[PDB]
Structures are given as structure tokens and as C-alpha cells.
Amino acid sequence: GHMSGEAPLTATVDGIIQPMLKAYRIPGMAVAVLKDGKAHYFNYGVANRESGQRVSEQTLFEIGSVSKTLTATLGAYAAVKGGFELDDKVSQHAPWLKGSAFDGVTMAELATYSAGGLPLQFPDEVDSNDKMQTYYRSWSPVYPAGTHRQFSNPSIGLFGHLAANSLGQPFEQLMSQTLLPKLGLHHTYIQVPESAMANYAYGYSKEDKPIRATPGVLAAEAYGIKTGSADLLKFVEANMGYQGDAALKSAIALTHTGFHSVGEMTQGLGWESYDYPVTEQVLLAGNSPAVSFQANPVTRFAVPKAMGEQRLYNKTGSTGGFGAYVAFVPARGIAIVMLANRNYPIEARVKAAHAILSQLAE
Numbered sequence: 001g002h003m004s005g006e007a008p009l010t011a012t013v014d015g016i017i018q019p020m021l022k023a024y025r026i027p028g029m030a031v032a033v034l035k036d037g038k039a040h041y042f043n044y045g046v047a048n049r050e051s052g053q054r055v056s057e058q059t060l061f062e063i064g065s066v067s068k069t070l071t072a073t074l075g076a077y078a079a080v081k082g083g084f085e086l087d088d089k090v091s092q093h094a095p096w097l098k099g100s101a102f103d104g105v106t107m108a109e110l111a112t113y114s115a116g117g118l119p120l121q122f123p124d125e126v127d128s129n130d131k132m133q134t135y136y137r138s139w140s141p142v143y144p145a146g147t148h149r150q151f152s153n154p155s156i157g158l159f160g161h162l163a164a165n166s167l168g169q170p171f172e173q174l175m176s177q178t179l180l181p182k183l184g185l186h187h188t189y190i191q192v193p194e195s196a197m198a199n200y201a202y203g204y205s206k207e208d209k210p211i212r213a214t215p216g217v218l219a220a221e222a223y224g225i226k227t228g229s230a231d232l233l234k235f236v237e238a239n240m241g242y243q244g245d246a247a248l249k250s251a252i253a254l255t256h257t258g259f260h261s262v263g264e265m266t267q268g269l270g271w272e273s274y275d276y277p278v279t280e281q282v283l284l285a286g287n288s289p290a291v292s293f294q295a296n297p298v299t300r301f302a303v304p305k306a307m308g309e310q311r312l313y314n315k316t317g318s319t320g321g322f323g324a325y326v327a328f329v330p331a332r333g334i335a336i337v338m339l340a341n342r343n344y345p346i347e348a349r350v351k352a353a354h355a356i357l358s359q360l361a362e
């Protein structure tokens, strides 16, 4: 329908989400939406299949690459506070990288996966800081800087790591002691403390075994975050219109800058954005493997550009046992967060989210 109100919103959300849980055998999902800036919460199923613990808005889910939006915000915050400038060469912020290829890569290129073909993951044996440093120092670019986007955990991971170091604090400390408290996120973690473990969902693998995230070099930066729908929606609210800390406001704003595009998807810091309104087909294409699995030449921007409020900003994320999606449209006052403890297809996430956002826009 094209009617608004509480009744049609529930009919739509329940009607979209429930069949999807069944189709993909998703044990639990927490959903939260914004309509005209007002929040609505929908919880389904269980966080722990063994115990029967029900999902709530406080259940912690792994959000995979959605973590990169927080990593990017931390990076932006460091930039605002004077740790670095986006056009600085990476090696200006890493002495051990002087003389390497990172003499010719900018901090922005690193953050936006356009440094020149840094891979999706580190090679298998690169699993200590010393080995990581050797890896980057030795790395040889596949493409000229700024020309190709290849989604890469080593890329944005190094950006986060160096951004935090530019303020003289480790990444996890800056995140837990400053960024999350300033955003007012009090139940969001990289390392989940004992006191919060009771709310931590289990993920469920393709083999249907309970699983949680793998530790790793730069895992904090790449996929470190555990959070529930209520905290994640508050982070989304901060991205809709934030009035408070000027520095944090500036940092958030900087994550809405566009640097290049692949098709109709424009890459920012963390967030990837589209026109709004946008068709389901376009949103599916921009979130397809051909854009995330693979290297693509980019449509370059002459200069980075503030993308503004009339955009759909989004990010997908997954781990072995979890599947997350977040999208928001600042000008329209609408948003969706969908957190599940199964890694179910991105196409389904996008189709559900598009249907729900269409109803929220009424």
C-alpha cells in the first residue's frame, strides 16, 4: 500500500522478514528502522539455538564489514583532530613504510580500497605484526593508485591502524575509550567483556555449527564490531543529522564524502552510497560480488565531493556465522538495520531492505 502509519509498517516488516527467516533457516534477527526520525524495533527468533535465548535489541551480533563504517569514522575523527590529511602519502604516517610503494598511495586511497590492488585478505602466513609490516613493505602495486577499487581488508585495516597511531593510541583503545563513548554507544564492543557475554549471539555456519569470529591481524579494524540493533541504529541516527561534538560532527560528515564510483555505487569512507530514490536492481548490482569480490576500474572524481543528504548510504557485512545490512537516507529520515546470526545471501538482505525502505518513505 501507499498508506503510512504503524499498522502498515508492521505488516510490511513482519511480512518481509518472517518468510526470509524460514527460507534461509536464520535462527534469529534483530531489525530496527527509522521513519521520520522515530525508531521502531522488531525481533525474531533466537540468539542461541541451543538455549533458546530470544533475540532482542540488546543481542550482540557480529556485523562483519559494517565494522568498517566505524573504522572509517575513527579514521575521519583522527583526520579532523590533525593526525593526518587525506591526501598525505601513507608512508608519511608509517616510518617503516618509507621507501615502499606506500610513498605513492594516499591515506584516502587506502581507506577507499584504491591503493592499487591490495588483496581481499592477507596471505595465509601474514598473521603477526612483524609479518604484516614486511608484507606491506614488500607489496608491489597491481594498478596505478586511484584507478581501481578492490575491496580489501589489508587496505582499510592499515588505514584504521595508522589513523589511530596518528593520535598516539592503539585502534581498540581509541574506539572503546573515545569514539564509542562520544557516539553514545555503550553496548558496542570489539572485545566483548564478560559482563556482556550473556547477550552475545552465536553465529551459525553453512554446516549449521555455532561459530564466532576469527581473530586476526587487523581484525579489529576490518570486522571487529559486535553490537545490537539499538546501538547500531543510534550510530545510524548520528549519520542522519548530528548535533553535538563539532569534531565528531565533522568526522561523520567526512564519511559522506565520495571519492570515486563503480557503476552507480559511490565509495566513501566506510559507507557506500547511491542516489535516492534508487531501484532495487541498482542496489543489487552495487552490492553484487562483481563489485565486492573483484577489482573494478573506477570512475574517478576530479576531487572528493560531499555527497549530501539525498543519498542512500549502505554497508553489508558478514562473518562465518552472521549477516548484517544497514542503509539510511538522511534527507528522507528513513533507515534500516538488519542483524542476523546466519550468513544468508546479500541479494535477500537488499531485497528485504529495499521493500521496507519503500514503505518507510510513505
Ligand SMILES: [Zn+2]
Pocket (backbone or CB within 6 Å): 001, 002, 362
Ligand atoms: Zn507510494
Ligand SMILES: [Zn+2]
Pocket (backbone or CB within 6 Å): 006, 009, 039, 040, 041
Ligand atoms: Zn512502531
Ligand SMILES: [Zn+2]
Pocket (backbone or CB within 6 Å): 125, 126, 127, 128
Ligand atoms: Zn604466524
Ligand SMILES: [Zn+2]
Pocket (backbone or CB within 6 Å): 161, 165
Ligand atoms: Zn603499527
Ligand SMILES: [Zn+2]
Pocket (backbone or CB within 6 Å): 180, 181, 185, 186, 187
Ligand atoms: Zn559507554
